[PDB]
Amino acid sequence: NDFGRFPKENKNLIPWGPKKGKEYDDLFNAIRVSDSKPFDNKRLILVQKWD
RNA sequence: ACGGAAACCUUGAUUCUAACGCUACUUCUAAAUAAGCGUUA
Numbered sequence: 434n435d436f437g438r439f440p441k442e443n444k445n446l447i448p449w450g451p452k453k454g455k456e457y458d459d460l461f462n463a464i465r466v467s468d469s470k471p472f473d474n475k476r477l478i479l480v481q482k483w484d
Numbered sequence: 485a486c487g488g489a490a491a492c493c494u495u496g497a498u499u500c501u502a503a504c505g506c507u508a509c510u511u512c513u514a515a516a517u518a519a520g521c522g523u524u525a
Contacts, residue, residue, distance in 0.1 A: 444514075444515085445514095447514080448514090449513065449514035449515090450512095450513045450514065451512085451513060457513085459513065459514065460514095461514060461515090462513070462514070482521095484521055
């Protein structure tokens, strides 16, 4: 989206939301990702950032 | 020492019976708690 002070993403490129008088066209409402069953704290470590 | 005197337009009566402010309607739609590590030493 170049119509602005600095560029940003075009959120309307993949259509989402309801439209007035138009058929519902949300693709990523059809993809529904559930979360995980909780795992244990025995699987956790204390890593550090290296660049 | 009057066409005059005496005489309640009065008694008893429920503006009452029956009737759902009800029927239908997702607070809904997309969205990684994530990005940047320069320069000096």
